[PDB]
Ligand binder design. Structure first.
Ligand code: CL
Ligand code: CL
Ligand code: CL
Ligand code: MN
Ligand code: MN
Lengths: 293, 5
């Protein structure tokens, strides 16, 4: 597997002109999936990471925006990265997006990290674009290869024992961090329970404790749930993604939680910015923002 | 279409 060749071809389109595809070979992509899978399984399902690093939220196949995020933040390994999931579906270039991310994981496995989002899940792919993209540009066997890799992604990260990171949010079933550690891979995303909630739940200003989620799955959680969680586990911040936010980032619960969303002008249906969070050596947080067009 | 579009 020639990682540098692959990365070079993926980066060739920098400076376009969003639209131009990068079409790797089927064998190359299979290799990216198999090798990255191995690395994911070799590392904990609950990552323990060090600052400084950059944290990114949803990308959703907006490949040319991913390239802008790296241009702003430094291409790996110039900065360490943690992505919070939702690499595929909705956008025009999910394949380029996930392939560059997997290539970087293989090249820089101790300095580049990818968590699982609710879209790194076959039943959601089937509906929201990635299955169709794979069928059109490759074949459904390659889609299954991707799913097999997704099924091995880690689920959460803690940065320097103080910033708890996950795609969706908290769970009414999350009492101990060991519950996350015990989760065996490969696994699908279940339609209920801890793993589901970590990838699906949302904060809500109008809910006291736990509430119904209008997505039809998981829950919403209020500010007091966040406060209690941070106190119980001696954390300073929850960092999550999963919801489009106008500024690209948005604080909740007296700045005890932040939502990151990194795909600007999402679906061409929102006028949102995309943000990446810079976490310095002392865990101070700042932002790099792709303003809407 | 809320799955979120
Ligand atoms: Cl796009
Ligand atoms: Cl398509
Ligand atoms: Cl649930
Ligand atoms: Mn999501
Ligand atoms: Mn998303």
């Amino acid at each position: 597997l020639n990682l540098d060749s692959i990365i070079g071809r993926l980066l060739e389109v920098q400076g376009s002109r969003p639209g131009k595809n990068v079409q790797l070979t089927e064998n190359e992509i299979r290799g990216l999936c198999l090798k990255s899978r191995e690395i994911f399984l070799s590392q904990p399902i609950l990552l323990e990471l060090e600052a400084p690093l950059k944290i990114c939220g949803d990308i959703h196949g907006q490949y040319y925006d991913l390239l802008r995020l790296f241009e702003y933040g430094g291409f790996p390994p110039e900065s360490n990265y943690l992505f919070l999931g939702d690499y595929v579906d909705r956008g025009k270039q999910s394949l380029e997006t996930i392939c560059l991310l997997l290539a970087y994981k293989i090249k820089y496995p101790e300095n580049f990290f990818l968590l699982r989002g609710n879209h790194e899940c076959a039943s959601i792919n089937r509906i929201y674009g990635f299955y169709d993209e794979c069928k059109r540009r490759y074949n459904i066997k390659l889609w299954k290869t991707f799913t097999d890799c997704f099924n091995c992604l880690p689920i959460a990260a803690i940065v320097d024992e103080k910033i708890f990171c996950c795609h969706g949010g908290l769970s009414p079933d999350l009492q101990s961090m060991e519950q996350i550690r015990r989760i065996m891979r490969p696994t699908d995303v279940p339609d209920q329970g801890l793993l589901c909630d970590l990838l699906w739940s949302d904060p809500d200003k109008d809910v006291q404790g736990w509430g119904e989620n209008d997505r039809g799955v998981s829950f919403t959680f209020g500010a007091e749930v966040v406060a209690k969680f941070l106190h119980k586990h001696d954390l300073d911040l929850i960092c999550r993604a999963h919801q489009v936010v106008e500024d690209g980032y948005e604080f909740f619960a007296k700045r005890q939680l932040v939502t990151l969303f990194s795909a600007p002008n999402y679906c061409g249906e929102f006028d949102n910015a995309g943000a990446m969070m810079s976490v310095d050596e002392t865990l101070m947080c700042s932002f790099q923002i792709l303003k809407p067009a | 279409x809320r799955x979120x579009x």
